[PDB]
């Protein structure tokens, strides 16, 4: 059965079904609450190369959605746009009533191609994609989300800045996936799994100020050296 | 069924004074009220509607006020031509709900 | 905006009687029409009303003794069936008045007619 | 009680919620847009509340997933009502002994 | 919280949440009821020129729908079909399950054009559009509705012929909107805010009997004089 | 009590409802069409029930609109269930003294 | 009691249900397909339960069809919740006499 | 109201609304259960010619759907695909969430043509069509279902091999309908109302072994003699 | 908006059924009109709103289509039905009054 | 229903693939059959139900389409593939037998 949390004396206990306690008091349905908590609060990796490896494609399982009434401010949020090599779309369109996560600091927008097996993209660890007050089990196309879980509670008787970071991934869904951070329609930077979003913004600023942007009609991909960490090579 | 009661049965006053007539309603009817003056041998003539709005052509001396359950009508600077009976009517319900919505009658001398 | 009444006469009890009210200055399709009687030296008594939709409404104490109908295009009639000695009165005829707002509601009975006299 | 088994815990909970409680703000025509209906708060003070919530949420996921698999709803909105009905049924389900250990009735 | 009406001794009272009233009794869910009441019962203007000015257009608010189990017979109902100047449609299509109001006496079918700002048509006073046992907050295209409000009650423990009137509107939604009552595909009458539906039907009949219909390929618009009220001019 | 603050009141409520309670009329194949499942009624007599009920309807709309804004339901069908659950919880939602003023249990 | 008026009665009920109760089977990614989430059983032993059940199912259909006709839901999922709420309201709905026949608070 | 069955001491009794039964106990919502039972357990005809006469067409009645949590293995299930003579489709497509009956021994796949009056296909006897945990009042196109009814209960406090049989019908829905059991794309057998599925499979095997399949490009329709029942005539 | 017609001197024997297709560059929500212009005479409206028949026009002509594709069909063509044909998109005069004509298609008996 | 074909003596060198388009005035729910007719011989069935390949026909011919637009593609055109091609809309003989043939398209090697 679904556990129910009881808060008393500023302490949280799991309700016991067989043992009937009389101390706890319920007065109205206003006390019952559902809260969604982000996975990043548990100290897990949040960058795109490590985050995108927790999602896998499957077929033969219908999706399910359950609502929640309160959430937590998310520092990292994701937005996916994946297409098959022939040109078809992988992720389904967002149904009516589904909206992106309301409070996101950095929105990682990833667009690319992959084999796209199966039909729906599930979470390998069994978590939920939170969305806007509607936690689902699959990923929808073009809608911002955030990994997290849901808990049910009995409550006791008693500014906003959004920044979008754009990526480009090749081989999405496989073990050999190549990621590229985008600073311009022609200039890219090779992406490693140790760059915080602020570091990527600083790299963009350095690219723009130092005049390393592509001047020809082709593509230019920079590679940052590991030791000095400030002199981009190629 | 709102029942209207006219308190002063009859009023007499020297010419030039101010006559006050009280009309009380059983329920609360907001500001839905009308006043009529009936000279003998004549049909009633409208004076005030909505309990505060003057009719067209009636002199400004007649002035009504009140709201809720109590309403009053004051005739200031009485003249010999104002001697008649006065009625208060309630206009709270629709026009198809018919009942005894009128008042008793106040004879002013 | 003026109305008038006709048809008052002396009849024996049980003799059916009919009165007629005609209007001028407005249309029957835009206003109701109410009949109000007054016993000599008494208070006014609302009898019934005829609407612009064609239906009529009667008071509880006059549920079946009186009928109100619309004849022609600008006339209405009040028919008294089986009158008694208690129905000797000055009958009137008025139009309900609404100034703004929706229909089916009124603010006053503005154009009172001269009123006919019925004696039994 | 419950103990947090996660590798790390965040003691402060920065939340947003839609419940508020003026003038013509409740009119949908004059109301706020779809992005201005939220509030803000911070439960910085805690006595193990937040680190316990982060573990209770981790624990409930297996039961929630199995329940979602069992049902056939496209969208589920009636879990809390079921919990409340279950609570009431557990409290009083008939044959309430006055002095028994099954009733909350305390004689006086 | 949502107020709840209690009927006791043929009197209506508002339930008090803090004070537990012992005499109140609820034996089964059959006693609970929700009823919708039209606004015309409060004595408000019902003609199209005055009715259409209580609705506005807006964008950025999702529509919501709530059910009710009983209603009141409505004398006036409205049916809207509005086009943008280029030719598109303003009002959204009626979702499945939504149907027109069951009991209407006069249905004012209005078809016309307007700027059509925003995305949805809301009620400026905060009321609802009743529809059939499903009160919504927006107007759907080509569906009969009636403005009303919903109330909740605890019940005490114990022919139909319609008429359609056809209008045409120019500049719908703006402060300068022009309405025409249509008697034929070619003949129209300029509309005022003082005509009852029966008067409009009589105008129709008089125009047909008097042979005032248009005989050319052009349009003919009559104008009833204010004083005589029976001599239609032009 | 409730006082009617509307400009005017219609004292009669000519209503239609859907609940009825023969032969083969219950079978959908032989049942009535979608337009003949309604009934009628007229509550011509009232002790001010209709005039106060209209004011109650006007009063409830602000709370109803705020509740609709808060939720994410496309169509809401469960308000009455919540009202019933709240009623039951308020009547009996924990320890209940026999002689307490907050309990409906009476001794005899 | 219930007497079976059907032409014939099958004494055995070969049923299937979706409720189950392991490792990673609860995760939808590694979980069973949509066709393998069912169980199986056989209530061969019976004491007239099956014959009564078939007749009860036959009897229920008129009320079920009328209820479905009355409502406006496209898909109904809340019948059992209504039954539970009605049961609780009938058991406890207001004033409760301790020794009255309308209450189940046995004294001792 | 909806009857509710209670199981006490291995006996089923209908709960009485007015009489308050003290012995009845309900500890949790897990005890409440909705079960769907097939009509074939009541001793009714199951072959296609008799079964298809219990379904009719109508228009003006919307369809309704309810759920159930437990079912029964079905010996016979059906699957319909009907078209109008002009080429259009009669039965509406399956909405999202509707799936076939999970446990069927034989599936009678029927495809053909008919007048197809009305808009929806209802059951003449008032029963339900059981899909996967969903009882509906109408037939959906190309979806396996079983005729059945739903019962509600309070529980006491305490391989799969399917076979598809293919048919073909002309004039579906009328009183004069002709059915033909299909053994090949070119060979058919006249169907009567006294053949069990095992007999049909035996006839198929005999047709294949005896070499009575059509060799030309035309159609060959066999007809079994009534007396001998093993020497097919024509 | 660009209106592309059949753009061909279509020849059809007397008694046939000729069809002219007028494709657009975007969705126009069925706001087309058809004009028949004989040499020298001013054009004449035939079908408006892409389906409705103008007054005084034989039911022989029939217009159909939607979205971005619309067709005009003439049945049992006679010797009189020999003129240029135009498809034309219009607006509603409450807003803009913009309008664009088609290229023009000629029909030979 | 009027069936409009390619209506052109299409010529294609040997080895290429030719395409014939058969338009309709309304939705026909994919009820078309393709026929070829050599000069003098009676026509022969090629494709029925707009996609199914009739018996005794090489896999070179292919049919596709839906709604109102349907196409027949002849792959690897040969010398013998020189005949007049027709598209026919048929009905189900349960309650009707109406059938409309196409105009006819000639193919030149
Ligand atoms: C609630 O919180 C608990 C914390 O206990 C979470 O439990 C985690 O569950 C996931 C899988 O569900 C575990 O991830 C697994 O990691 C294995 C390797 O361990 C890695 O992590 C440990 C951490 O100490 C390192 O020491 C180690 O070096 C590894 O880096 C993998 O083998 C598992 O599968 C992988 O390999 C297989 C086979 O190739 C692939 O098929 C898989 O796709 C995958 O690549 C798996 O990844 C994780 O270790 C658990 N945490 C802990 C602390 O034990 C719950 O998931 C959480 N619940 C929710 C709903 O969030
Ligand atoms: C529940 O019942 C109450 C009272 O019965 C209703 O209150 C009404 O509220 C509306 C607006 O919500 C009021 O309408 C407004 O009228 C203004 C002019 O006032 C006239 O009416 C008053 C009545 O007392 C007179 O005193 C006065 O002299 C005028 O004759 C208009 O100017 C308003 O329009 C402006 O505001 C709206 C909304 O902001 C804009 O959209 C317009 O463009 C314009 O800027 C407005 O129309 C009405 O007067 C109130 N009635 C009373 C009796 O006071 C509630 O509305 C009702 N609830 C529901 C849900 O119906
Ligand atoms: C619960 O259990 C009861 C009892 O078993 C079921 O009741 C059955 O109801 C159906 C109709 O709802 C009955 O079917 C009817 O049969 C009539 C003829 O009787 C036949 O069956 C009897 C059985 O003894 C035979 O003796 C007799 O010879 C017949 O073979 C028909 O006249 C009925 O209508 C037919 O004719 C009309 C007019 O021509 C047509 O319009 C109809 O379409 C149809 O063709 C009808 O078919 C059945 O007989 C009842 N059972 C019994 C035993 O009498 C309930 O149906 C069941 N509940 C559920 C939900 O299934
Ligand atoms: C990368 O840096 C460039 C240069 O600073 C950004 O472009 C500027 O963005 C600011 C907004 O912060 C604007 O006010 C300037 O007008 C922009 N200038 C130019 C030349 O574009 C760019 O937005 C940055 N990109 C990201 C993803 O951070
Ligand atoms: C206006 O009145 C005319 C005349 O009554 C209506 O035209 C007739 O309507 C009736 C039904 O209402 C039809 O049976 C007749 O065939 C109509 N034509 C006649 C009598 O010549 C007209 O429909 C009315 N218009 C509106 C909008 O109510
Ligand atoms: C009828 O019987 C024939 C032969 O018994 C079936 O044809 C065989 O079907 C099996 C599986 O169903 C295949 O593995 C074989 O390849 C088939 N061909 C043979 C054995 O030559 C046929 O499928 C049966 N049809 C029906 C409707 O039951
Ligand atoms: C990815 O998986 C494939 C599967 O065979 C394997 O061949 C390949 O070496 C893997 N790549 C990496 C980088 O692990
Ligand atoms: C309508 O609003 C516009 C806003 O600019 C104003 O100019 C115009 O005068 C208004 N018309 C009326 C009739 O109030
Ligand atoms: C089917 O019904 C029609 C209705 O007229 C009737 O003519 C025909 O004889 C019936 N067929 C059979 C086989 O009874």
From TrEMBL, chains A, E, H:
The organism sits in which domain of life? Viruses
Q: Where in the cell is it found?
A: Host cell membrane; Secreted; Virion membrane
In this protein, which residues make up the domain named Filoviruses glycoprotein extracellular? 1-234
- Disulfide bonds, which pairs? 77-104, 90-116
Q: How does it assemble?
A: GP1 and GP2delta are part of GP1,2delta soluble complexes released by ectodomain shedding.
| Functional description taken from the UniProt entry | Acts as a class I viral fusion protein. Under the current model, the protein has at least 3 conformational states: pre-fusion native state, pre-hairpin intermediate state, and post-fusion hairpin state. During viral and target cell membrane fusion, the coiled coil regions (heptad repeats) assume a trimer-of-hairpins structure, positioning the fusion peptide in close proximity to the C-terminal region of the ectodomain. The formation of this structure appears to drive apposition and subsequent fusion of viral and target cell membranes. Functions as a decoy for anti-GP1,2 antibodies thereby contributing to viral immune evasion. Interacts and activates host macrophages and dendritic cells inducing up-regulation of cytokine transcription. This effect is mediated throught activation of host TLR4.
Q: Which family does the UniProt entry place this protein in?
A: Belongs to the filoviruses glycoprotein family.
What is the name of the protein in this document?
Envelope glycoprotein
Q: In terms of the whole protein, what range is present?
A: 32 to 287 of 676
TrEMBL record, chains D, F, G:
Q: Where in the cell is it found?
A: Host cell membrane; Secreted; Virion membrane
What range does the record give for the signal peptide?
none
Q: Which residues form the Envelope glycoprotein GP2-like HR1-HR2 domain?
A: 13-90
Give the highest taxon in the source lineage: Viruses
Question: Cystine bridges: which residues?
Answer: 9-51, 96-103
Q: Which family does it belong to?
A: Belongs to the filoviruses glycoprotein family.
Q: Tell me the subunit arrangement.
A: GP1 and GP2delta are part of GP1,2delta soluble complexes released by ectodomain shedding. Interacts with host entry receptor NPC1.
What function does this protein fulfil? Acts as a class I viral fusion protein. Under the current model, the protein has at least 3 conformational states: pre-fusion native state, pre-hairpin intermediate state, and post-fusion hairpin state. During viral and target cell membrane fusion, the coiled coil regions (heptad repeats) assume a trimer-of-hairpins structure, positioning the fusion peptide in close proximity to the C-terminal region of the ectodomain. The formation of this structure appears to drive apposition and subsequent fusion of viral and target cell membranes.
Q: What is this protein called?
A: Envelope glycoprotein
Say which species the protein is native to.
Zaire ebolavirus
Q: What is the lineage of its organism?
A: Viruses, Riboviria, Orthornavirae, Negarnaviricota, Haploviricotina
Q: Which gene encodes it?
A: GP
Q: Which residues of the full protein are shown?
A: 503 to 613 of 676
């Amino acid at each position: 059965s679904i556990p129910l949390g009881v808060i008393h004396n500023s302490t949280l206990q799991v309700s016991d079904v067989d043992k009937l306690v009389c101390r706890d008091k319920l007065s109205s349905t206003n006390q019952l609450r559902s809260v969604g908590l982000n996975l990043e609060g548990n100290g897990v990796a949040t960058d795109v190369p490590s985050a995108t490896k927790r999602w896998g494609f499957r077929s033969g399982v219908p999706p399910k959605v359950v609502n929640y009434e309160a959430g937590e401010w998310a520092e990292n949020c994701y937005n996916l746009e994946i297409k098959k090599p022939d040109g078809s779309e992988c992720l389904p369109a967002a149904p009516d009533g589904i909206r992106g996560f309301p409070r996101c600091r950095y929105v990682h927008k990833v667009s690319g191609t992959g084999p796209c097996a199966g039909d729906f993209a599930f979470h390998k660890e069994g978590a939920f994609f939170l969305y806007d007050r509607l936690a689902s089990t699959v990923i929808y196309r073009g809608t911002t989300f955030a990994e997290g879980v849901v808990a049910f509670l009995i409550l006791p008787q008693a500014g906003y800045y959004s920044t979008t970071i754009r990526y480009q991934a090749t081989g999405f869904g496989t073990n050999e996936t190549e990621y590229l951070f985008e600073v311009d329609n022609l200039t890219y930077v090779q992406l490693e799994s140790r760059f915080t979003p602020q570091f990527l913004l600083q790299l963009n600023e350095t690219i723009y100020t130092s005049g390393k942007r592509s001047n020809t009609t082709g593509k230019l991909i920079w590679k940052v050296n590991p030791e000095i960490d400030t002199t981009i090579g190629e | 069924d709102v029942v209207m009661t006219q308190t002063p049965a009859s009023v007499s006053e020297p010419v030039g004074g101010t006559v006050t007539i009280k009309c009380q309603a059983s329920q609360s009817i907001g500001s839905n009220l009308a006043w009529y003056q009936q000279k003998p041998g004549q049909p009633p003539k409208l004076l005030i509607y909505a309990a505060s709005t003057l009719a067209s052509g009636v002199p400004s001396r007649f002035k009504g006020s009140g709201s809720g359950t109590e309403f009053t009508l004051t005739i200031s600077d009485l003249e010999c031509a104002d001697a008649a009976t006065y009625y208060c009517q309630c206009t709270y319900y629709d026009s198809s709900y018919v009942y005894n919505n009128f008042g008793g009658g106040t004879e002013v001398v | 905006q003026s109305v008038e009444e006709s048809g008052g006469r002396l009849v024996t009890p049980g003799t059916p009687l009919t009165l007629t009210c005609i209007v001028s200055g407005f249309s029957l399709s835009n206003y109701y029409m109410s009949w109000v009687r007054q016993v000599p030296g008494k208070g006014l008594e609302w009898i019934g009303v005829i609407g612009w939709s064609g239906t009529s409404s009667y008071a509880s104490w006059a549920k079946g003794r009186f009928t109100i109908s619309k004849t022609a295009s600008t006339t209405v009639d009040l028919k008294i069936t089986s009158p008694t000695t208690e129905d000797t009165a000055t009958y009137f005829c008025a139009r309900v008045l609404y100034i703004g707002g929706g229909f089916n509601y009124y603010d006053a009975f503005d154009p009172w007619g001269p009123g006919t006299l019925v004696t039994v | 009680a419950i103990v947090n088994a996660q590798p790390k815990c965040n003691p402060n909970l920065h939340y947003w919620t839609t419940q508020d409680e003026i003038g013509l703000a409740w009119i949908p025509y004059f109301g706020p847009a779809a992005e201005g209906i939220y509030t803000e708060g911070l439960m910085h003070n805690q006595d193990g509340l937040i680190c316990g919530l982060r573990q209770l949420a981790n624990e409930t996921t297996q039961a929630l997933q199995l329940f979602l698999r069992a049902t056939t709803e496209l969208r589920t909105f009636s879990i809390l009502n079921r919990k409340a009905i279950d609570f009431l049924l557990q409290r009083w389900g008939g044959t309430c002994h006055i002095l028994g250990p099954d009733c909350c009735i305390e004689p006086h």
